[PDB]
């Protein structure tokens, strides 16, 4: 692996975590599972909800959470109906009566996972990866972006040999610490294989 | 007056107690030779004093804390020097000339995950 994870070494500066609270060898253990468990069921349903990130905290014997959805409306449904239903899922998969809430995400076409899960589906939707990623994905540039790019995986199309497509605009110097770039992936299970996605969204340096 | 001398280097940290007159030293409830003495050329403590004398002039009673042998006493060296400014903040330009004011920037080296000792690596015969 030449390039490492541009998001990994960023939790320190210019990039926030995803589960800020506290825990020791005792709780940290059960805690690591919790944050996982939830994000699992929550996502599956919040799929069509257009998610960007799922923050998770914990004040005391209860989790906070912050569903970062580009459209929490669907997460509501009959006004409270949908939300409420899931609001119970956590309280049971967390072991304690945890709170809940969200924070809609505008400009979703300029978000890693969001854009990632976007171009990954078009595949099964019968589209031309190239003509798509170089268009219905680079759109972020339009939004006065500073730099962005996406690097697909192998088994592209009906090919029997894995590969990787280029296509990129702006500048994505995944070496500058202050730079800050949004990274994410999505293993869009292709009808005949399992292609991957890699979105690099750099929005301003420091 | 109750002067002060950092004397803190190589994992060590001393406290040069420069008292008025009396060139006697008593580090850690004991004198120079009454401790680390007779093990190394630690007598290098007077080395700095070799530019303006001492004894009745000033005092070099110290007391180091933490660090290794040559480090503790060695720390005082780089400390006593700067610990003489309260007697002449302009005489400092007579200590660094013999390696003193400059803290011993040299320390241990972090062992790198992959090397026997952060520099040397295992052999590779079948290479």
């Amino acid at each position: 692996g030449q390039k490492v994870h541009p998001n990994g070494i960023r939790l320190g500066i210019v990039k926030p975590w995803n589960s800020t609270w506290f825990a020791n060898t005792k709780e940290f253990a059960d805690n690591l599972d919790s944050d996982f468990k939830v994000r699992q069921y929550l996502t599956k349903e919040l799929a069509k909800a257009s998610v960007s990130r799922i923050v998770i905290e914990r004040p005391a014997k209860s989790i906070r959470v912050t569903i970062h959805t580009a459209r929490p409306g669907i997460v509501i449904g009959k006004k409270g109906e949908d939300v409420e239903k899931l609001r119970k899922v956590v309280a049971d998969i967390a072991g304690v009566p945890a709170q809940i809430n969200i924070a809609e995400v505008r400009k979703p076409e300029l978000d890693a996972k969001l854009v990632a899960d976007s171009i990954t589906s078009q595949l099964e939707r019968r589209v031309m990866f190239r003509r798509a990623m170089k268009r219905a994905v680079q759109n972020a540039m339009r939004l006065g972006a500073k730099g962005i790019k996406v690097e697909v995986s192998g088994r592209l199309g009906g090919a029997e040999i894995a590969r990787t497509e280029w296509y990129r605009e702006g500048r994505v110097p995944l070496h500058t610490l202050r730079a800050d770039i949004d990274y994410n992936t999505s293993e869009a299970h292709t009808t005949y294989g399992v292609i991957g996605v890699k979105v690099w969204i750099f929005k301003g340096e420091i | 007056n109750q002067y002060y001398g950092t004397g803190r280097r190589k994992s060590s940290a001393a406290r040069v107690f420069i008292k008025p007159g009396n060139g006697k030293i008593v580090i850690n409830q004991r004198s120079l030779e009454q401790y680390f003495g007779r093990e190394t050329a630690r007598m290098v403590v007077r080395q700095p004093l070799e530019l303006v004398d001492m004894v009745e002039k000033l005092d070099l009673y110290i007391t180091v804390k933490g660090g290794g042998i040559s480090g503790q006493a060695g720390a005082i060296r780089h400390g006593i020097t700067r610990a003489l400014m309260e007697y002449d903040e302009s005489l400092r330009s007579e200590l660094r000339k013999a390696g003193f004011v400059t803290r011993d920037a040299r320390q241990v080296e972090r062992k790198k995950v992959g090397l026997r000792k952060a520099r040397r690596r295992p052999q590779f015969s079948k290479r």
């Binding site: - | 093990e39 190394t40 050329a41 290098v44």
Partner: protein, 150 residues
Amino acid sequence: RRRVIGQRKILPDPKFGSELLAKFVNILMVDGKKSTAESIVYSALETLAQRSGKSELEAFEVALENVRPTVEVKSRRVGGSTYQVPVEVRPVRRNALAMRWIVEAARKRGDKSMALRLANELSDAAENKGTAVKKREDVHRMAEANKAFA
């Protein structure tokens, strides 16, 4: 390779005052136990006293003069063949060469303690004899016998 350096000097003699002398204590020093080196390079002269007499300071260098070379050869490949072109060594490494070969034999004496295993060679030079002094002229053999080179 493409850079140049000066030298790495250190704290000289503990009292007799002698920078280069330190080398005799370092070069001989092993396992980084200089604390013991001073116990051998110093106690050595304290034994040669009655042995020789005159200041142990000179005593050392005295016989040392009959151990330091002044001309060596360095392998240089040319057209397949690697000549042994000679070359007169400057004082800098000269004195060093001696100390190396000197301390070596001393540790090959194969008797009891090094304090004595060291003095022996320290004096064996002047009087001429031992492995140490051997190399001295032994090097001269290869020397000039190749003068047809340099």
